[PDB]
Amino acid sequence: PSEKTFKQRRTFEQRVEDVRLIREQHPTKIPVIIERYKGEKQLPVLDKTKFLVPDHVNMSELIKIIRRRLQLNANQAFFLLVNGHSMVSVSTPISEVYESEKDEDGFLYMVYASQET
């Protein structure tokens, strides 16, 4: 097992350089880190945590992709918290979410949990 998050496993400079390369090789993708909330207990762990998401995909669509990857029941509660906090618009394309919520290192960080607060 690894206890470390992506940010704790890669230096700031390594992450900035990852984003630059992804930017040049995938100009219409947003680089997103999706991790399980640090003490989450109902939801399983995702197999992978690092994704490229097409600019046009909105949060509603991303949520349903991740839920399906987690093999969740339709009724199970799930929230995807961007840059620390519940997103109010779910129609917004992720390219625009990125503009308001991207980290200083250039990644977009999300955590998933069974509740919003």
Binding site: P1, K48, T49
Partner: peptide, 24 residues
């Protein structure tokens, strides 16, 4: 979600290499 790949040395023969992949 971490992987450590070890190559086994001293393995002849021949053109095939052995790796032990530890996934933790």
């Amino acid at each position: 979600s971490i992987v450590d790949e070890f190559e086994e040395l001293g393995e002849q023969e021949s053109d095939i290499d052995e790796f032990d992949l530890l996934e933790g």
